[PDB]
Amino acid sequence: GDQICIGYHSNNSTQTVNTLLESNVPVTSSHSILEKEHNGLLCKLKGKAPLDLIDCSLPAWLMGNPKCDELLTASEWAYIKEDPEPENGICFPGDFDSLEDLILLVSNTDHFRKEKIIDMTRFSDVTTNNVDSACPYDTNGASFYRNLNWVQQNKGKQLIFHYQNSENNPLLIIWGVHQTSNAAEQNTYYGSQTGSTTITIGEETNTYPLVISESSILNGHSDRINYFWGVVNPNQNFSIVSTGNFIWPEYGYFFQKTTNISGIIKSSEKISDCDTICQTKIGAINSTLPFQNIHQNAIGDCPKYVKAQELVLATGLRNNPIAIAGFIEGGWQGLIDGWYGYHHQNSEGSGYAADKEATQKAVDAITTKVNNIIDKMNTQFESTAKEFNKIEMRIKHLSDRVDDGFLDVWSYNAELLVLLENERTLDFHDANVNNLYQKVKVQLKDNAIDMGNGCFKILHKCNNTCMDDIKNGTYNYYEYRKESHLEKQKIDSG
Amino acid sequence: GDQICIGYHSNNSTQTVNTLLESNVPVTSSHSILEKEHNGLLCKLKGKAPLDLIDCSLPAWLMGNPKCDELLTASEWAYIKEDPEPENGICFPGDFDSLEDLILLVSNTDHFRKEKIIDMTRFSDVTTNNVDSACPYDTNGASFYRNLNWVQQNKGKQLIFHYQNSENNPLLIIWGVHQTSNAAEQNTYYGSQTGSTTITIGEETNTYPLVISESSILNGHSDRINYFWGVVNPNQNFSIVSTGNFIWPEYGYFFQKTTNISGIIKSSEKISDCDTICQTKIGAINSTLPFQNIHQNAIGDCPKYVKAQELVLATGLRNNPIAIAGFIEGGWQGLIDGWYGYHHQNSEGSGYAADKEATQKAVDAITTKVNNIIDKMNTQFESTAKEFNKIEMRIKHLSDRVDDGFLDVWSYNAELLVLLENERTLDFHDANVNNLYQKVKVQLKDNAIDMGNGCFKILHKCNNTCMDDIKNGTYNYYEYRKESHLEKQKIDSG
Amino acid sequence: GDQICIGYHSNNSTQTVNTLLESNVPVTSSHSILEKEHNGLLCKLKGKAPLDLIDCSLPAWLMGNPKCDELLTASEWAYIKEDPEPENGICFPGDFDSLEDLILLVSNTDHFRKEKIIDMTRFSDVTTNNVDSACPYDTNGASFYRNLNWVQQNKGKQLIFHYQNSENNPLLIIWGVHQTSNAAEQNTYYGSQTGSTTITIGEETNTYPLVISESSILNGHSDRINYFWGVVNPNQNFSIVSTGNFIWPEYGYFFQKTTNISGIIKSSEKISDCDTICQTKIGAINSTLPFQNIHQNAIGDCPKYVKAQELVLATGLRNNPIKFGAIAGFIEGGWQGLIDGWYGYHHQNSEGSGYAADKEATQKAVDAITTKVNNIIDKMNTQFESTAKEFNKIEMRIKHLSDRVDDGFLDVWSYNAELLVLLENERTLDFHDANVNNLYQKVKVQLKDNAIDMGNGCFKILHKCNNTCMDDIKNGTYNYYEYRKESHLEKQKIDSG
Ligand SMILES: *[C@@H]1O[C@H](CO[C@H]2O[C@@H](C)[C@@H](O)[C@@H](O)[C@@H]2O)[C@@H](O[C@@H]2O[C@H](CO)[C@@H](O[C@@H]3O[C@H](CO[C@H]4O[C@H](CO)[C@@H](O)[C@H](O)[C@@H]4O)[C@@H](O)[C@H](O[C@H]4O[C@H](CO)[C@@H](O)[C@H](O)[C@@H]4O)[C@@H]3O)[C@H](O)[C@H]2NC(C)=O)[C@H](O[C@@H]2O[C@@H](C)[C@@H](O)[C@@H](O)[C@@H]2O)[C@H]1NC(C)=O
Ligand SMILES: *[C@@H]1O[C@H](CO[C@H]2O[C@@H](C)[C@@H](O)[C@@H](O)[C@@H]2O)[C@@H](O[C@@H]2O[C@H](CO)[C@@H](O[C@@H]3O[C@H](CO[C@H]4O[C@H](CO)[C@@H](O)[C@H](O)[C@@H]4O)[C@@H](O)[C@H](O[C@H]4O[C@H](CO)[C@@H](O)[C@H](O)[C@@H]4O)[C@@H]3O)[C@H](O)[C@H]2NC(C)=O)[C@H](O[C@@H]2O[C@@H](C)[C@@H](O)[C@@H](O)[C@@H]2O)[C@H]1NC(C)=O
Ligand SMILES: *[C@@H]1O[C@H](CO)[C@@H](O[C@@H]2O[C@H](CO)[C@@H](O[C@@H]3O[C@H](CO)[C@@H](O)[C@H](O[C@H]4O[C@H](CO)[C@@H](O)[C@H](O)[C@@H]4O)[C@@H]3O)[C@H](O)[C@H]2NC(C)=O)[C@H](O)[C@H]1NC(C)=O
Ligand SMILES: *[C@@H]1O[C@H](CO[C@H]2O[C@@H](C)[C@@H](O)[C@@H](O)[C@@H]2O)[C@@H](O[C@@H]2O[C@H](CO)[C@@H](O)[C@H](O)[C@H]2NC(C)=O)[C@H](O[C@@H]2O[C@@H](C)[C@@H](O)[C@@H](O)[C@@H]2O)[C@H]1NC(C)=O
Ligand SMILES: *[C@@H]1O[C@H](CO)[C@@H](O[C@@H]2O[C@H](CO)[C@@H](O)[C@H](O)[C@H]2NC(C)=O)[C@H](O)[C@H]1NC(C)=O
Ligand SMILES: *[C@@H]1O[C@H](CO)[C@@H](O[C@@H]2O[C@H](CO)[C@@H](O)[C@H](O)[C@H]2NC(C)=O)[C@H](O)[C@H]1NC(C)=O
Ligand SMILES: *[C@@H]1O[C@H](CO)[C@@H](O[C@@H]2O[C@H](CO)[C@@H](O)[C@H](O)[C@H]2NC(C)=O)[C@H](O)[C@H]1NC(C)=O
Ligand SMILES: *[C@@H]1O[C@H](CO)[C@@H](O)[C@H](O)[C@H]1NC(C)=O
Ligand SMILES: *[C@@H]1O[C@H](CO)[C@@H](O)[C@H](O)[C@H]1NC(C)=O
Ligand SMILES: *[C@@H]1O[C@H](CO)[C@@H](O)[C@H](O)[C@H]1NC(C)=O
Ligand SMILES: *[C@@H]1O[C@H](CO)[C@@H](O)[C@H](O)[C@H]1NC(C)=O
Ligand SMILES: *[C@@H]1O[C@H](CO)[C@@H](O)[C@H](O)[C@H]1NC(C)=O
Ligand SMILES: *[C@H]1O[C@H](CO)[C@@H](O)[C@H](O)[C@H]1NC(C)=O
Ligand SMILES: *[C@H]1O[C@H](CO)[C@@H](O)[C@H](O)[C@H]1NC(C)=O
Ligand SMILES: *[C@H]1O[C@H](CO)[C@@H](O)[C@H](O)[C@H]1NC(C)=O
């Protein structure tokens, strides 16, 4: 008896997937949508180099700690890379005001250029470019921040200065305010019990009255110099009126703001010669997969952070391999050139044949599904600027629970997406196999006995042309009716 | 030979949809769930008018800048509409404290009424209602904020005032503190080198010591008047003790808070004669669709912001139109009065007929699906109050990434929702058509030949009563068995 | 004529569910994924007891208001339970600085121990342990915070103190700064118009200059004592230099930080003898269900807050039962008579009739639905939930940011949970239909033309089919050829009759 069977592809794969309904289902192929790779690399971001602060803190670098390299040429950077514990920080003790807000402005810049803003020689009856042993060039020297000019010996005299930004870029300036320890120290340094400074930027007034007060000794100092900064926009002016206790913004930085705030990547590692679309402090996430379980904080074009161990989409078929029987009893290791197909038996021989059209149709559909799940993750620029000052822990906690909130959303949704889609993909394969089965069944009608195992017992001699017609949907029922009827009669007696 | 076919509706639609499996699939009908219309209108919000500040800033209007229209009668508003750069702002230079917090309180109010709080005539040996050329009615005048009474010539004398809020609404009061330029100016205005004010609201004490300091000249002023505000709750008291340098809250506003914070809409446009459930600064989003791609910031009962270009749900069938064949080969342009139905062929004639019951059932199901996807988007009141002071850029950044976070959540989920639901809607239609096919098939049994094209070749004369019985599920197989068997015999040999 | 039918379970259930396509569909069984119970209970959190402040505020308890119970032994707590309006708060009027940040540190602690930090007798020519009628032990008395030592009569003299934390846990210290009303009061208390204090913790300097200023009368006081706090880490030092107007941190608390910030639960209720994985101020949420509509704010291992009134997953079948007498199959509805499974058979032959469940198909579907329900629940594996969402009174804009963050997540979870249920219910019902149809097809392909498909889910068998024959069909071992002849002959009678 000639036979034609419907069946599907099996293989040697050990891969499994989970669905909403079933766990650890063996499948012929699958595809991960979760980026998990740790490489520990620090790279350029979208072809743009980071600023390597070496062993200096950002304030130390900005203010020009003598132990920190000077910015000689116009530069740019995608993010800032800083050591977790810089050797060279603020050398003369004092607070650096609003560092977090400053980071927002300079984390990603397109032009960045140091320029002399003030001719310090224009002031009379004072000393300039003063130095201190707390800020040495190297072992035992005495120097100071390059950009910040410590003026002394005011003797209560008022210095007046005005500046106009006639360039096309905003100007970043940083200055210092000297808090002396006692009246004696105040006299030694300035020769008067006065020393207040008002610095005005645009319409904004900043006034620093003389403060004399003892503090604990840090780096050989019971006194402090507190640091502040401001931005002078194109065509804006700034002015200074000082009677003492002031560290002048002799040098400043012209810079061009960017739209995408990155932040500071804190790492001991050095910058490698590599490029990534997404960067973290423990490595690059150089991947367009929609999810990652590598790190909560990152910068650039990044997958969503989730806590999943894996997210594997089924793509292939249930891997349940079995005259040969058909799809009802399992898959065919022997069907090697497609997903769904046929096996035939007649006088001329036997063999497997793939349904190329049905296979390709399903391939396009599953590929479209996976690509949709991946490509629809079109994200906002990811930032790592998530710091607040030390008296703002409540805000940092809000920042933390915001990220916890999104973490729980993406984790749950990604996890359920995978389980649901895997269930459907497997049903989709079954529906496709059943369709080939039905297409054969309705062609043969009562010219065949449905064996119930995915195969048909044909009630007439069916040569290779006949087999091809069934597989091609061009089988003529009437052409074989008579022969089929005669064979059926014999069956109806035996 | 009599025939009955199962088929479905095609039409002239050019609409396409995307599914998880396929792209740009032609369908007979579809429905957008994404609001995209730009109208540029500023409207009432749920029948409630906004406050139009004209060309004044909110502080200028509240304090009663002479160039700003006075609130003459009690009012209310759903939101505040302010020019992006108001012509009339703070006339006497100084800072307005905590504007952002104030906006939370007065952006959406149910009552707002000005009332005189202090009889300024009760104070002796001072001058009141002082004016200044920086706050003119117009060119060359000298006037002042209507609500704020500038007291001078204290000569260090202590003024004492107490007030009890015996109304049921909170009372908003705004005051000013004069920072003079130098001792001489302090003398000219107050006749004493003293001038401190303590203002107490409920259990809260605010002390404003005398500050004398030069600032840069703004509008002819090197001195400053800085503005502060407070809220005196129902049955709370406030009191003032002042020796000078004080601008008194002669007038204040009783106001009724609402639960739903809206905010300030910044636009040059005027308030039009329209009404919307959701408003943005570039136009109304007067729509109950679950998503919108119009603007990140909005107020009211609003769809979620997404970055999608379109979100179109399939509602109708694949629009793939094809003696006539049935559903296997495509849809019927000839089936005009339903989604699924039949075509029959007999001696009495031929024609199309819709399955009304199957069509209505599917219509109800799809209507339910679309309405669920829309109506389940039942949202919290949307606010545009997302401002922080200029020294809080880190918090504004937190606010920005929060919205970036939700934008990415809603965009990805809406996009995938549409793709998944479109796939299922198309399969739903296939399943319904297949059901009608099976229902005909199992009635006819071997009284007909399944032609494999969605049509049946009936082996007996099947009149309109017979055709109706098949479509109605009341066909009697046994009634036509004998006649059918005879035709089959001719077939099993012929 | 012998018959075999394929059908499914019905019962007396009145439960309904909603799907994307249909509303209020009666089903034989279902399962809620929404925790809705209000119990008003305050419990231990994961076996860890809360700190009950009784009728005291957290600052009053920390500083040792005499009317508040003293911490006598080392302790621990999962969260802090405070009355909404404590009777005993700050007795000497003044502001308590940065309470919100402090809460982040002490809301959940593993060791917490009061210890004397400063020997106050080391200071000469001053008075210590000063008291005030605003902080009494009882009626008409005068006392003071136990932990805070009010030093007076400095007479401008500088006191100096240095301390090193030589223990293994951080040290919380709390101090006070006296703002006097006027020069006369300043003189009465300190005998000098000076009184500034500098307190240094590690490298962090805090200076509190003398402020003399009148305020309104609160609890009989026009003056103020303002409170501040700091944390001295293991091996860190702190120091104090004061010339007056200072209330000293004589006692402090050693404590061990935890990773999971809980917060303050505000309630009038007392602590019950119960245990919960998630707690709110209106009751325990002792449930691993993925969603809850009980309260926006909670602590612990908690379901996500949603605004849904209900989220009921279908588990069982459409409960649409069919109206001796011929019985139809699945096409016309379910079987009240099928009691031992979800899907199964009904047969009729010469030996009798009866219902029988398909055990294998029932078990397979039960495992599948159980897996589905458990996935929807167990994948909700959440970050520790916190209720610390407070900011100072001059920070309403940040509180508003916090509020809209929560509104934002509320809208996400509500919409997604609601649609998850509608989608999954639609699919669960289709899943049952597909399983029933599979049994139908398996019988059909076995019988072939040895039977007439009646179209109601039943087959009229064209030969005598006894109990062995019926068992074979149900077991998939029916032999078509064994009955072909008899079936064909019976078909002949039909093709003429
Ligand atoms: C940024 O700062 C600059 C520099 O000015 C400051 O310089 C500091 C060093 C400090 O001393 C500070 O006090 C200075 O203001 C601002 O530009 C200045 O603006 C002022 C007006 O505010 C101009 O003053 C004018 O000076 C004219 C005389 O000198 C000019 O012309 C001379 C030839 O005769 C020439 O030799 C000289 O070098 C100058 O070029 C004088 O004629 C003017 O008198 C008229 O003033 C008004 C006219 O309407 C009227 O009231 C009066 O009766 C007279 O008719 C006037 O006093 C300065 O010239 C000008 N300095 C420079 C170098 O340009 C700048 O102000 C902004 O730009 C200017 C050009 C104006 O448009 C301003 O309105 C504008 O705000 C500051 N920029 C900002 C953003 O604040
Ligand atoms: C808001 O302020 C009002 C107004 O009073 C303030 O007025 C300012 C101008 C300023 O000077 C401020 O210091 C004032 O307190 C508060 O109401 C006042 O409350 C005080 C007590 O806090 C009452 O004082 C009493 O006065 C009684 C005499 O007045 C009554 O009789 C007269 C009839 O002609 C007339 O003078 C007046 O209209 C009253 O009808 C006097 O008998 C009392 O003596 C005994 O009282 C207590 C024992 O209870 C004891 O301390 C005292 O030694 C005596 O034994 C007492 O001195 C004021 O009468 C009262 N003023 C008015 C007009 O009501 C208000 O306080 C709040 O309301 C009152 C009614 C009380 O319940 C308070 O407990 C409560 O806090 C302030 N509101 C708030 C929330 O603070
Ligand atoms: C799925 O897995 C099975 C293996 O588990 C695999 O079938 C195996 O294929 C290999 C060859 O790829 C066969 O290996 C042979 O084993 C015989 C003994 O049984 C050896 O004698 C053979 O050795 C000769 O040939 C080798 C090269 O073919 C030479 O390297 C060697 O020197 C000898 O000349 C040979 O190794 C193995 O027998 C089969 N096993 C079975 C049961 O078929 C199957 O191919 C996998 N499926 C796919 C698609 O990969
Ligand atoms: C932290 O405090 C310790 C303890 O010493 C201190 O004790 C109190 C009671 C008071 O008398 C202080 O004046 C006294 O310093 C310091 O340890 C001391 O170090 C200094 C030298 O810097 C020395 O004078 C003491 O003898 C040391 N005492 C001992 C035996 O610990 C800390 O000093 C720092 O830490 C030490 C480990 C040591 O390496 C020292 O060099 C270092 O500076 C104090 N820390 C600071 C910076 O204040
Ligand atoms: C700043 O970051 C954004 C990330 O949103 C970048 O915008 C994306 O750019 C590419 C093409 O320019 C697209 O794939 C995305 O659709 C864009 N997203 C959006 C929201 O427009 C942007 O290019 C970045 N800017 C720079 C200079 O890197
Ligand atoms: C404040 O805004 C909220 C939006 O959340 C409005 O509440 C909705 O209003 C109607 C009935 O008032 C309901 O259909 C929605 O379900 C409500 N949502 C909630 C959470 O209650 C509310 O109407 C607004 N308040 C006013 C008076 O305008
Ligand atoms: C702090 O809270 C977290 C909440 O995530 C707890 O971490 C969970 O621990 C339990 C078992 O203790 C696991 O079932 C979860 O998988 C953990 N969640 C995650 C995402 O880590 C943690 O145990 C808590 N710590 C303490 C001391 O109770
Ligand atoms: C990141 O991806 C790009 C594009 O695939 C590739 O050229 C580059 O080598 C990748 N970098 C790393 C770290 O592999
Ligand atoms: C807003 O919608 C309502 C109800 O659909 C409608 O009546 C009204 O015309 C709309 N307003 C605008 C701005 O068109
Ligand atoms: C139509 O169908 C119903 C049920 O299938 C049947 O009861 C009714 O008699 C039919 N209508 C006619 C006119 O026969
Ligand atoms: C349901 O229906 C009737 C109502 O009383 C009852 O007699 C019958 O036993 C019930 N069925 C079951 C399963 O209990
Ligand atoms: C909380 O759940 C646990 C575990 O199921 C149980 O032992 C305990 O009784 C529950 N507590 C409450 C509040 O009922
Ligand atoms: C195979 O069968 C067909 C159908 O009858 C016949 O026409 C044809 O000759 C046969 N082909 C060959 C090559 O034997
Ligand atoms: C059509 O044919 C059927 C079957 O013979 C018969 O019962 C019925 O009367 C006929 N209908 C009409 C309209 O005559
Ligand atoms: C029932 O019928 C079968 C079918 O031939 C027969 O073999 C068997 O003996 C009968 N069963 C019994 C035990 O009566």
Numbering used by the authors:
A (entry chain A), B (entry chain B): 4 to 325, 334 to 505
C (entry chain C): 4 to 326, 332 to 505
The authors write:
Two highly similar crystal structures of the A/bat/Peru/10 HA ectodomain were independently determined to 2.15 and 2.24 Å resolution (Cα r.m.s.d. of 0.25 Å and 0.34 Å between equivalent monomers and trimers). The overall H18 HA trimer is similar to other HA structures with a membrane-distal globular head comprising the RBS and the vestigial esterase domain, and a membrane-proximal stem region containing the putative monobasic HA1/HA2 cleavage site and fusion peptide. The H18 HA ectodomain was expressed in the HA0 form. In contrast, H18 HA has a dramatic alteration of the binding site residues where only three (Trp153, His183, and Tyr195) of the key RBS residues in influenza A viruses are conserved, although Glu190 and Gly225 represent consensus sequences in avian HAs. Significantly, Leu194 in influenza A and B viruses, another critical residue for sialic acid binding, is replaced by Tyr194 in H18. The glycerol side chain of a canonical sialic acid would clash with Tyr194 and Asp228. H18 HA exhibited no specific binding to a custom sialoside microarray (data not shown) or the glycan microarray of the Consortium for Functional Glycomics (CFG) that contains 610 diverse glycans found on mammalian cells, including over 100 unique sialosides (α2-3, α2-6,, α2-8, and mixed linkages). The lack of binding to sialosides was further confirmed in a plate-based ELISA with glycans 3′-SLNLN and 6′-SLNLN showing no detectable binding to either sialoside, in contrast to H5 HA. These data strongly suggest that bat H18 HA does not recognize sialic acid receptors, and its receptor remains to be defined.
We have characterized a new influenza virus from a flat-faced fruit bat (Artibeus planirostris) in the Amazon River basin in northern Peru. While our phylogenetic analysis indicated that the Peruvian bat virus shares common ancestry with recently identified Guatemalan H17N10 bat viruses, their genetic and phylogenetic divergence is such that we propose that their HA and NA genes be designated as new subtypes H18 and N11, respectively. The influenza HA and NA proteins are critical for interaction with the host and determining the subtype of influenza type A viruses.
